[PDB]
Ligand binder design. Structure first.
Ligand code: TPP
Ligand code: TPP
Ligand code: CL
Ligand code: CL
Ligand code: CL
Ligand code: CL
Ligand code: CL
Ligand code: CL
Ligand code: CL
Ligand code: MN
Ligand code: MN
Lengths: 556, 556
């Protein structure tokens, strides 16, 4: 008889099913309509439970979790605009591949389009952005549990990457006594409840075949571009490229070690671009390439074929080159297409890359964001991970430093949003347990401000560098019109973060030089908490230093 | 020739066209892709420009503006998750009628699903939540300006209520000199550029017909239920119900003056409900009724007829009574269905309503949220406006105080989200220019924390009361389960707002008695600046006081 009790039994099947697909982490926002989902999750000891009050934050927390653990991470939210806040993190997931299982509570069909409070049209509301969309029916004992677990099984079994959105109508009485309504119904699943596999096993592998002409292509004048990939993938790619004798352009996100550093600088030099005109094939592994000069070279170069090896799906070359798009695990792929010993063919690029770095070393003293980015390894935590925020920071680290091979870097570099960086960071460190360094801009920090709440619960030191250049200074770098740049572009907020840290009880440091920055780090890494280091810098110095260094290099 | 210059030409046609439909406020977030729209907006002298860095807050700021002004308000954002953030405000607008014109910038078609940075598929991404979706084509001179303005003219001309999503591909060379490409193409529109009406006027009106059996019905035992309507409509409805001799159950949002106050209390009393069983007809004006007892009585009652009169569309009875759904401006409808002076048929309800308010007044003294709610009248600015947050506050002011007839009230009571209350308040005050009192919960305040940024800029004094009962205390009033309530429901963040206030250079108080609250307000209505008043209150007291007042009143 009890609707209250049955809703929970319905929800218990949902959650148990996700358990069979490697879902450990679950992110929960407060609600009433979500009561069946939340209580089922709460009482299921397979989960590690995370909670937060801002649903946009909640999505990004889940996104950081899935980013690092490579596992499907679940999200429970209540009906209404709560669901709509998951949209940004879902979008990023859909572009970078994080498996997010969004379980969104709903009013039941009777309470739709009739002025019911906090009742909206939720089925379909993320359009094409989920990989799978399940819109569950009203819960009824007339639909057997086997269908409910099968539906979920298929969605998860076949999920290569990106998000699944499972809309969960519940009618209400939501609370009440657990009388054993639906226990019978649940029992038709038999000992599946004691099993560790899913009910229906459906896991087709999606993968491109061996390139049988690889033995031919591996001998051409090639170039290796390396975008976003795993830390270990980064090392493998470096040795591979080296063996071929092909120049490797490694992104900040590559973790290759960057044997030809300051690509964003040297690629702007005619000697480099014309040397590369000799490249017969370009093999790019991973994507989301950072620098302007890399994108621009890429968009303009004309090899015989262009390859992109990556674990995600769909076309990845925005310049649409003739070539191949190869779906694979990068490490697997490298083993399936091993490098072969060849003499290098580049003469000028190794030279320019060295000079480029030197021009930057020559500028390392000024206490500016350009320099912080140059010097950033100095500050990497031992056995840690770097989280790079968006806008100027990622561009400057990519252009001016040479990150160590196999040192973990993480970013939200799919949609490049500045909406969820702090909570994504929270996820990232939570996932792995590692000491974590996260560097972010001032608007970025202002955007995801309340995420500082999550930053009270960290398992290893997290250092949050907020670079404060009073506004979105990237729009200084781009050729924006002078007269409406302050108001409509930069949007300085004229604020500091001392009071932010105070509010949430985090250590704060506002260093005036390098000696003070190192002493802030020394204290920070001592304790499994989050320290906020505000780096206040002159608004336009970073962008100008980049432009100058670009110009300098382009004359060498 | 110049794509740059034409992007801007195209955009200015769009923005100019909005001009002819009373769009005067415009809300801009920072970005590169949105350049054509933003620059066109900036140079167009019709618009009052508003800016913010958080796009979710931006949407809600526009919601605020559109709410008060009852004009269409435009929003510009850039491509990527920026767009996705408009969702919450858009869902709200869709339910309550605010006219939000979302001009969302987008990459051109060549750059979608090809690994291009910050490119996602936007056309259709709000599903069916917009009233119209204009998905614009790639800008070209081969499509006449008369098409562009006409498409915008149609969507805006026909717009009864809710948002229009206008997606705007712009191909890049976004910056460049402003040569005279597409001037010739603009001129094909002739002297329309000096006109003040639309190019295509298509403005059909949507109305219900005169109810020609009204003279029959107005003599039966009727009940007037009044929900969200304008402040002038509240006064009229009070005059009307009084004349007919029908009891008026009036919501916080109604501005009717509430002449049977504390309905949430007296509707729980059996004598009141049985007297209401004699109701032959129920005429509700407006919608989104607040309280449980009203929502519950409304659900259960069985009058021969049930009428809902509101200028929004669709069904508004979540109990789906046999009756009438009349789409009309309330002020107009009342004139078209005038009252006739008649002897009030209710006997005990007035007595119960008085005794209920007395029960409440007898409890005014304790320094807590329930008591703040009850006496909020005392703090209302002269010639000002109220903005009520969600959760416990709106429930408490509806239950425990009697707001003045005609004194303007506003809320986000469609989807009842807690995600945009401060930024909505901002736009609410900005639209009217009136001194504003806005009260909100702690988690509410945290959710929209960065909106404190906008509150630095206020055309009249704004007081923001933040009730801090350490968590979502509504889940203390709802019969949620014991051992998982704090963690999965209330989610206390153990925090204050002194520092938040400080960060954003806003005056802060934290009164500890009625006197200290009076001193906080002495200063608060003089200067056109924002004052934060944090009300620290025992977590659980509000909920229990309501519960007790409920129990006390049912015994009358
Ligand atoms: C959600 C979202 N909105 C807007 C943008 C456009 N955008 C890119 S960078 C930027 C400004 C970043 O400001 P800040 O954190 O101060 O970084 P800085 O420009 O100084 O590197 C904006 C608004 C975006 N990427 N994501
Ligand atoms: C965007 C959104 N997420 C979640 C909810 C569900 N919800 C309704 S009330 C509430 C708690 C509000 O807490 P607070 O601001 O402290 O007010 P209090 O409960 O103490 O009145 C929540 C989470 C919602 N309405 N909107
Ligand atoms: Cl809820
Ligand atoms: Cl159904
Ligand atoms: Cl960026
Ligand atoms: Cl700390
Ligand atoms: Cl942009
Ligand atoms: Cl609410
Ligand atoms: Cl100042
Ligand atoms: Mn900045
Ligand atoms: Mn609260």
């Amino acid at each position: 008889m009890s609707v209250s009790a049955f809703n929970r039994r319905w929800a218990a099947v949902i959650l148990e099913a996700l358990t069979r697909h490697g879902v450990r982490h679950i992110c929960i926002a407060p609600g009433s309509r979500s009561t069946p989902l939340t209580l089922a999750a709460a009482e299921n000891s397979a989960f590690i439970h995370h909670t937060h009050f801002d649903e946009r934050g909640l999505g990004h927390l889940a996104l950081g979790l899935a980013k690092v653990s490579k596992q499907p991470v679940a999200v429970i939210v209540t009906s209404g605009t709560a669901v709509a806040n998951l949209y940004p993190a879902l979008i990023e997931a859909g572009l970078t591949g994080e498996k997010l299982i969004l379980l969104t509570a709903d009013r039941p069909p009777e309470l739709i389009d009739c002025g019911a409070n906090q009742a909206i049209r939720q089925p379909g509301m993320f359009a094409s952005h989920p990989t799978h969309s399940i819109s569950l029916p009203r819960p009824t004992q007339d639909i057997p549990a086997r269908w409910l677990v099968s539906t979920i099984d298929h969605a998860l079994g076949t999920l290569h990457a990106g998000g699944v959105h499972i809309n969960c109508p519940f009618a209400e009485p939501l609370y009440g006594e657990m009388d054993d309504t639906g226990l019978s119904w649940q029992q038709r699943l038999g000992d599946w409840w004691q099993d560790d596999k899913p009910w229906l096993r459906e896991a087709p592998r999606l993968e491109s075949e061996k390139q049988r002409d690889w033995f031919f292509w591996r001998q051409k004048r090639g170039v290796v571009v390396a975008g976003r990939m795993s830390a270990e993938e980064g090392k493998k790619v470096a040795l591979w490229a080296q063996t071929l004798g092909w120049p490797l352009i490694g992104d900040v996100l590559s973790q290759t070690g960057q044997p030809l550093p300051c690509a964003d600088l040297w690629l702007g030099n005619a000697k480099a671009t014309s040397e590369l005109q000799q490249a017969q094939i370009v093999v790019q592994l991973g994507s989301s390439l950072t620098g302007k000069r890399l994108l621009q070279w890429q968009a303009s170069c004309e090899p015989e074929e262009y390859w992109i090896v990556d674990d995600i799906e769909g076309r990845l070359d925005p310049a649409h080159h003739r070539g191949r798009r190869l779906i694979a695990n990068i490490a697997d792929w490298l083993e399936l297409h091993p490098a072969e010993k060849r003499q290098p063919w580049c003469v000028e690029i190794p030279r320019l890359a060295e000079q480029a770095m030197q021009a930057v070393i020559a500028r390392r003293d000024a206490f500016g964001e350009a320099q912080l980015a140059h010097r950033i390894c100095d500050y990497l935590p031992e056995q840690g991970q770097l989280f790079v925020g968006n806008s100027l920071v990622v561009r400057l680290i990519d252009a001016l430093s040479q990150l160590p091979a196999g040192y973990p870097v993480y970013s939200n570099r799919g949609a490049s949003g500045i909406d969820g960086l702090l909570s994504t960071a929270a996820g990232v460190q939570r996932a792995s347990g590692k000491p974590t360094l996260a560097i972010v801009g001032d608007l970025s920090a202002l955007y995801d401000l309340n995420a500082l709440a999550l930053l009270r619960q960290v398992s290893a030191p997290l250092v949050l560098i907020v670079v404060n250049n009073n506004g979105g200074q990237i729009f200084s770098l781009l050729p924006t019109p002078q007269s409406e740049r302050e108001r409509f572009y930069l949007m300085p907020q004229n604020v500091h973060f001392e009071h932010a840290a105070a509010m949430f009880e985090l250590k704060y440091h506002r260093p005036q030089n390098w000696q003070e920055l190192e002493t802030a780090f020394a204290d920070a890494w001592r304790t499994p908490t989050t320290t906020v280091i505000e780096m206040v810098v002159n608004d336009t110095d970073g962008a100008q230093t980049l432009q100058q260094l670009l110009a300098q290099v382009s004359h060498l």
